[PDB]
Amino acid sequence: HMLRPVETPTREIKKLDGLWAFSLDRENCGIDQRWWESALQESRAIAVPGSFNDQFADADIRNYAGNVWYQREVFIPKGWAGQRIVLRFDAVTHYGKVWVNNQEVMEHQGGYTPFEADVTPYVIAGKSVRITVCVNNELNWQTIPPGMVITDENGKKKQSYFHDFFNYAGIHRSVMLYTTPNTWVDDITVVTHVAQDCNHASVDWQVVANGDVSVELRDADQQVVATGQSGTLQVVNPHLWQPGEGYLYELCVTAKSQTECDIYPLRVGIRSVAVKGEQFLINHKPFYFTGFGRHEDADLRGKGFDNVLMVHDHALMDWIGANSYRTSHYPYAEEMLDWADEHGIVVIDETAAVGFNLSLGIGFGNKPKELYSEEAVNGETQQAHLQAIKELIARDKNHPSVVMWSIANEPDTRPQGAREYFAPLAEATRKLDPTRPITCVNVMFCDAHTDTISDLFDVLCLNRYYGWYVQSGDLETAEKVLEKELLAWQEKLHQPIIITEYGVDTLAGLHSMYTDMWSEEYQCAWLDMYHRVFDRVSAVVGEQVWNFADFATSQGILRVGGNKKGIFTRDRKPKSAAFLLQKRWTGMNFGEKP
Amino acid sequence: HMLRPVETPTREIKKLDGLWAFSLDRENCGIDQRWWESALQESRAIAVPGSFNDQFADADIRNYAGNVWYQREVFIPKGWAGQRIVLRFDAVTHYGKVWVNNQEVMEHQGGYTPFEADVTPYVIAGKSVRITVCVNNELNWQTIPPGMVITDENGKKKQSYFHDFFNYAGIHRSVMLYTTPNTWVDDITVVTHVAQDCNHASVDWQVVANGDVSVELRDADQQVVATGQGTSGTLQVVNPHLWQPGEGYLYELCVTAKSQTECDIYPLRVGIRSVAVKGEQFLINHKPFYFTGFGRHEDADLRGKGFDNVLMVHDHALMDWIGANSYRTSHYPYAEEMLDWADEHGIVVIDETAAVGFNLSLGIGFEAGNKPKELYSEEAVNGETQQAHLQAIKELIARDKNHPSVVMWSIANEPDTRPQGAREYFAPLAEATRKLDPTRPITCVNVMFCDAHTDTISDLFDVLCLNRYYGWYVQSGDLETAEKVLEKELLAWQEKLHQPIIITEYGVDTLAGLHSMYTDMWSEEYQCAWLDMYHRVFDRVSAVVGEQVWNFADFATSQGILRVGGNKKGIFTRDRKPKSAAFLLQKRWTGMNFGEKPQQGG
Ligand SMILES: O=C(O)[C@H]1CNC[C@@H](O)[C@@H]1O
Ligand SMILES: O=C(O)[C@H]1CNC[C@@H](O)[C@@H]1O
């Protein structure tokens, strides 16, 4: 059960003061000596939220593998006596264990979604409370994403993994205490059915075993459009949420007990999404995706959320004419999807299940020789995977801006076990939520004649790098390979085709008369050639450029101080292909394919 | 009366949530049609804290001159019934006017120090209250810093100013509502006297509004070491753990404000430390100290001068790594988080007002008009510029009075002191500052072309602060001639004043990546040679007790043929990557013993 806390007759004290106390645990004796009982000795100030890696300009902290300890004091507001008090972490990347003054509150494996707990019997209103959080950043074969910790014969752990971005960790998002009465709306699901945009229904389902519920549908002018009294349904008149506007009704659910009362406001976007034939229909009209795969990657904070960075990246995506993006390779911060709700941005929401593939040269030992096996990606990783889809859906269900779930990124689907693995996951997800199409984004070398699993999904998502990783430098042959491959998919599946990734590394400042790789002239010619090919194949309904910005990776001979396929630098300065994308994307009609 | 909000039987609701509503006012009718009365129209989301300029990647918001509108709703807690509620803005840059549901509560001009208002009579506990703020970013001759707003024929205003950083504006630090009981400690002043490091007296004086006071002084182990009574006139005798550069041991002063019915307790951090200028030495706890480090800026990539916690932790990691022990709040007061950090980690800090650009002889700044023909006149820098300047000195001292890390007040930065009337202006504010805070030495930072033969006002101050660029702006490229000019100038300054000499700005513009076998201007090799030549001169002049490299990091300036996308004299880049010179400084500042002048050897 998860909703984003709001303020009303429910309160919140945001505890991301910044400046917790922080210390490594190189000897792995924190839990044994129970460091949560006292103040951490030999600690230093750390900023919350933000990754602990890049915060101290220290190579030993940055590449650290083990447990790290956060700690902070905080006075509980005296006006909270007799309320339910919830300690919420919006994200603790990979693993957290929480103590409130010698008492353990909660522990969570899965570093991108919230976890909260009821802390009433362990705090008294008005006195100071100590919170210790033991964060762990290790990946093994049953974490999402997977990884492999290797120890030397001397005892220092080095982490290996199989995805392209760097393995930042720490407290990445909001820690907050929020209160609620002891009669409290705990969960609301709303499904919205449309059919020629003139009168449509909002089925309701909501759970609070603590009180009886009234529901009342407000509009943007705070005037009531419908009312009902769990398992509700309301019928309404026309003004849909559309990728242009993003008109949001606001549905206040009241939970009445005789003694107490609780009001929770949930914003509803009224619209439909459905795949038919080769079309991706938003409110029964075909839609053409444009935009980026992104990353939560910033200069000094790592993957730490930041409001200024959010406003400025959306100013850039607005200027460049993108209507859509994909939360590439892990669930994003919540405010991202709240912003897309208000501004009508289409989002592909995606689980952290990346790196199920031992055949890439990206992302940092001796790896197992068959991927699907006990040794790696066994039954326990399948259920850990499924738990990640449950948590992601449970968090983002009501968001209108999420038009599609992506259960995994670039899995190796050639060995079997790939289908024996992904078939139950696609079916569990489809029943967890049937209001949105389902996809799995497919890696390049699993071409149309080789991949095993994409007929279990609704939309086909392709990451193609012809002219980069294969046919390197030759736009002409890469053109012909590209335009032979997507026609091959179209005949095979007759599904909508989104190219969720296409991009080439580009050094900001490298200019060439010869249009060769790494130069800005090549990123321009490359993107345009992919565009010529997209426009001639009817089945492609979306383009998303690989990354919007340069981002940090693990060290390697293939990554010049990071992944450089950005349209913008890590500084968010535009490479000269930003004006290529702005000109094409804003010249087209909104949401419609050239 | 100014105090840092703390949480001890007192509560705060940080309204920094960012994502306020934001709107410009190009027709300048927001005051006319009463924009605070309803929700801002055609607004957009803005992050707070943070300058508004670089946030939307649009030049016409960036160079906007006029009023900006922020707006936000906030639910006010039920359990603050019998409590006093205060709305506080730790910085609204330049001018800010606030409305609490159609009622103006506050108004402030001064972009870098906090202002607050008591909001109890217009707030209902439990109901949502809407907060509208009108911010202005204009500078005239009686603002600090000064400037000239230039109207074209169509009413579009362009701001010209005379300082070398961009004029970022908006709500730059943290906006909060906090409580207090209706009996409350409103101001504390603490002075600490040192007598050869064995026993000392902490003069206390407190202005509680509404109660008798006891004080209690606790150590780092929270054990009581001294008690006292009375609204003031508390002086406590210790056998102490001094606040030292390097460690920064902080006692704790618990001030009790007890009335008949209510109670209020405020914990103020107290560093036991004495600062004194004796001879050509700057003594901290009666020992000669050598400053190393930086002039800084509150400047980052997309938040402008917006405060940020990751950025503060990382920059202190770097300043600790490179061996710096000091810095100067270059050109405006910094956030209090910065000076609280310096208090904890024993970092020596020169505090500075915003009085920069009292000089119309520099190519620095924005030149979008015609500058006045005389700086010290009724048209520019008049008696009201002097009162605004005094006001800025009082607010600055009123906030940082008890920070042990502050060792000096900087009244102004590089004023032009050749014209008569520079002393008619600066003498009264120098004595008024000494009457505001007589426990810390006083300085004014001296511009390069006011040499020892020409400067008129430096004898009014305790420490001589120099900004020199020989071999850059003059004798360009010529290291061997520059060495002679610099050593001649520094020996002249010492002989004329016999004050301590801190070089608060020396640096050269340096493109990261530009390398040269000829050690040319703008190359990383030049930066290195230039810094090291300056260092050989310093080490030969006894009166020099400090070196502060001009900037820690590259920062944004206004457009001009002298500023390649900003000022590039940083040791680090804007995204905090080290230039070659960073390893030069690290070898010097970590090779010296801590806090002591290199004896011309190694
Ligand atoms: O090679 C690339 O740049 C991309 C290929 N597909 C997956 C991405 O994580 C990766 O970054
Ligand atoms: O020109 C420079 O680089 C510096 C000269 N002295 C004043 C500073 O504000 C300025 O940044």
Residue numbers in the entry:
A (entry chain D): 0 to 228, 231 to 365, 368 to 597
B (entry chain B): 0 to 601
Authors' account:
However, intestinal bacterial GUSs cleave the attached glucuronic acid for use as a carbon source, allowing potentially toxic compounds to re-enter the enterohepatic circulation. However, microflora-encoding β-glucuronidases (GUSs) are notorious for reversing the glucuronidation to release SN-38 in the intestinal lumen and thus represent the major cause of undesirable effects. GUS contains a deep enzyme active site (the two catalytic glutamates lie ~12 Å below the protein surface). To understand the underlying structural basis, we prepared C6-propyl, -hexyl, and -nonyl UIFGs (2–4, respectively) and resolved the eight X-ray crystal structures of 1–4 bound to EcGUS or Bifidobacterium dentium GUS (BdGUS).
Uronic isofagomine (UIFG, 1) potently inhibits both mammalian and bacterial GUSs, owing to ionic interactions between the protonated ring nitrogen and the two catalytic glutamates. Inhibitor 1 appeared to be potent for both human and bacterial GUSs (e.g., Ki = 180 nM for HsGUS, 16 nM for EcGUS, 7.4 nM for BdGUS, 6.5 nM for CpGUS). Isothermal titration calorimetry was used to measure the thermodynamics of the binding of 1 or 2 to EcGUS and BdGUS. The potent inhibition of 1 was contributed mainly by enthalpy (ΔH = –10.47 and –9.12 kcal mol−1 for BdGUS and EcGUS, respectively).
